[PDB]
Symmetry: C3
Subunit: 374 residues, 3 copies
């Protein structure tokens, strides 16, 4: 009856068949994270699986399962995958590579689950009465209900929309909001203070067709211009006065005729005359005519003498008066004053003068006559 | 010769050398996902590797390889990594933790491959003839060609650009389009109905410098104004009539001189006169002068008496007529009618009058003379 | 003493206790990536762990640890997880599946680390002096400092902001810049050439209230309109001349009264007259009045006869001259020339004429008188 102590040391090639009970394997080959203490330094890992909250892990204060893959030996270069132990589902990866693989140089852990990314699924649907100032973390959310935007706080407008947040830094937080009608608003939380929502102009809130182009600002295009304009002070030439008759109040004649002009200023026409020895003078205002004339007779023989004298011109209507006097042509014997005259008759053409003497001597007398008529 | 049945049970320490043939290993330590049935529940996993389409996997109806890492034993807390079996290359991670690790509390699967996120590579390049209404899934796509945007359907404009899509919910899908020239449009599919593209105003489609500011709207700034304006009804003062000579047809004199005025209205100048006993009267229209005068002589002694009379003023040209008569200054003895007269000669300065009597008593006569000339 | 060579081939079930020293395990079960050459093709992987830079790995030229999980055997279908060996921390996954699992059909490698995604942490903060043309890779970056944007190159504006980049393709790169005040600019590098930044109009750079609506472009609304306007040429009627007195220089009377007018043109007033046998004539220029009259007497009874004659009108001031002559009414016995006359006295209303005869016969004479005065 052979005992184990009777069996010599064997090479692994002696197991020619069968499958080992998994209890014969080191724990790390069974998926058990129990090979090393649960605070082991993953930087100095030599086992392919551990569970540790060591600070060289990816998240301070948290446990992670850490798988390790090694080359050229378990002290050399390595790749590590860390997966969370509790609280959340997270994965990270890192690597150590060095020319001397034992002098490990670990790169930073890199996140391997989309929990650190902008995801194709939305981060959430926002309810009513929410203050958008609290959305200080990167992501994108839906506001499905305009009333819920209106019922909230710090929405740019009371409309359903899409909120996108970029948290670049605690002091630089950018938010964008796009309404269900396509309008964009943007604001930033700069150094802890939210700046005003900036509103883009779009074809839903501005129409330049309602506003006047500079090219349309012209006199020709101005509507409502009156036909005539109050004139400022200006002068004129008489040639520009084209109708009417200027009255006496304005220094005018009050009429457009010579006779009417004289009548309105009380002026009279000039006189006409023939300045001859047998001449005349006419006042055309009244039509009165005054003529004078003289005739040479000679001696008065005695008794009574009648003579007809013809006026320089005929009186149009009548002779009103005659004034006969005696002229001395010569003084042969006595003066012509010894002859006296008187008018016998008058007509429009002339008169008849009678003469007589009171000395029976010779004379050379003439008859002067002045007449008045119209 | 010994048979295997003669050999007792051996401890693992009996293998002192060599590398086990991998066929001796539990299948999971060889990478074989054959340890359990392919519908096993990963929630109850006790093996480090399985392949299962059980509902508790990450994607309904699909097979996944699921790795499990356990602590403190294979019935306790666990971390799981699921990788796809076919169709796509996907990875998920989850975890179970509990105070009593045997009473597992699984968290939801978290996706690891970037297929679930907005990726730094584009989701694709859009060809010609595509209807953008069909892009209802989150992502971003490239339209490389303006002609293909024009040849498609429901692009905001026929220009190459970038399309970004946010499927926030089946009834809330947001699209943004940025053209190659920087112009942004936005629209939303609300409850399955696409709303109109909203077009932002930018310096590519709007120039405020082309529109008139209110501050530039003034009379002084209005271009195209006329130099003069058609006047409306107004009045004037004579002082504004500054040039020209008003014609008779309008009530004017038709001349700028007093002589020309009289000539144009047919008016004559006024007469002058010296209204004295020995006086004169002149018609300045014709120049005719009439004079009258008297002198006291006294008694007529007899015979023929000559006396010279000097006109008040001298006739400038010639005397045309004289009218002598007799005046009675007094009647000391007899009346002056007994004396008669006649004119002998006449000059420009006066005349000579001859007198005779027919009664021989003492008279006191004078001589009156009236003269006409020019 | 039993020799190992005397021990028969054993089944794995002979190992009833203990844990194998890990040196007994195939290397891949120890986390060692040394089972195959480090250029082995992962498409033909039959071991669960290798390290290779073969072209069929995820990133050309780079080494990756490649884990494999197999079904139904190590030649069949497989899932593979690749993790980086150096330089960066990266993870990838792929799969092979086919109806005949041993004739593999590999799907493309899919990335798992968030390095391939838009992440919820920014890609970096930009310093001063940076040219944004170099940002040709997808991501989002922070410009914290307006001075650093001004001090850089190819920023749209010298303001702090957020830079978002979409590298769709080497020929299609889109950039968006959102300033800390909420203003958005966009540009595109198209086929290797950057195009100008496009500036959106928003309420921070454009206020329509400053610009004039078309509705406000009206004559009534235009400010600064003058009260009066320079008139163009026009004509007038005399009635529009409502004040002033036209002077002689312009063809006017220089006066608004008849008398004044006459004086300014040097004109005289009309004469008046009573054209009767006992009539008168008046020169209203000088006021001189000339009268003529006649009275029939009959016979002269001898002696001295005085007779009063009354002037047709009274001289307003004085009678300056009378001219008496003798008229013949008839010739009964001798002529009226045998009667002579002379004036005795004169008044404003009449005169006294004395008469005598040098015959002693019957006459029928009258007295004519012409008078001058004012
Ligand atoms: Fe005017
Ligand atoms: Mg006159
Ligand atoms: Na005689
Ligand atoms: Na005597
Ligand atoms: Na008698």
């Amino acid at each position: 009856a052979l005992a184990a102590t009777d069996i010599p040391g064997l090479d692994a090639s002696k197991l020619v068949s069968g499958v080992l009970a998994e209890q014969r394997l080191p724990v790390f080959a069974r998926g058990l994270a129990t090979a090393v203490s649960n605070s082991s330094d993953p930087n100095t890992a030599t086992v392919p699986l551990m569970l540790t909250n060591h600070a060289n892990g990816p998240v301070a204060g948290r446990y992670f399962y850490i798988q390790s893959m090694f080359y050229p030996d378990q002290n050399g270069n390595a790749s590590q995958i860390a997966t969370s132990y509790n609280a959340t589902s997270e994965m990270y990866v890192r690597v150590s590579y060095a020319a001397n693989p034992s002098i490990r140089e670990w790169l930073p852990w890199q996140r391997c689950d989309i929990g650190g990314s902008f995801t194709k699924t939305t981060d959430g649907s926002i309810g009513n009465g929410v203050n958008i100032n609290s959305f200080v973390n990167s992501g994108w959310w839906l506001q499905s209900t305009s009333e819920w935007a209106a019922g909230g706080a710090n929405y740019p407008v009371g409309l359903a929309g899409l909120l996108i947040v970029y948290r670049a830094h605690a002091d630089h937080i950018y938010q964008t909001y796009v309404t269900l009608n396509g309008s964009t608003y943007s604001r930033c939380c700069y150094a802890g203070s939210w700046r005003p929502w900036r509103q883009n102009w779009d074809d839903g809130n501005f129409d330049p067709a309602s506003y006047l182009p500079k090219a349309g600002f012209t006199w020709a295009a101005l509507p409502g211009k009156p036909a005539t304009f109050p004139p400022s002070g200006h002068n004129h030439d008489t040639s520009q006065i084209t109708s009417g008759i200027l009255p006496l109040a304005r220094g005018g004649l009050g009429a457009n005729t010579a006779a009417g002009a004289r009548n309105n200023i009380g002026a009279g026409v000039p006189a006409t005359a023939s300045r001859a020895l047998n001449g005349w003078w006419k006042d055309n205002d009244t039509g009165l005519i005054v003529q004078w004339m003289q005739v040479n007779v000679g001696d008065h023989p005695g008794g009574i003498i009648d003579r007809t004298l013809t006026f320089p011109i005929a009186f149009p209507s009548a002779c009103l008066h005659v004034v006969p006097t005696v002229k001395e042509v010569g003084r042969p014997a006595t003066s012509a004053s010894t002859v006296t005259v008187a008018d016998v008759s008058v007509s429009n053409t002339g008169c008849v003068i009678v003469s007589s003497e009171y000395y029976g001597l010779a004379q050379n007398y003439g008859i002067r006559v002045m007449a008045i008529g119209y």
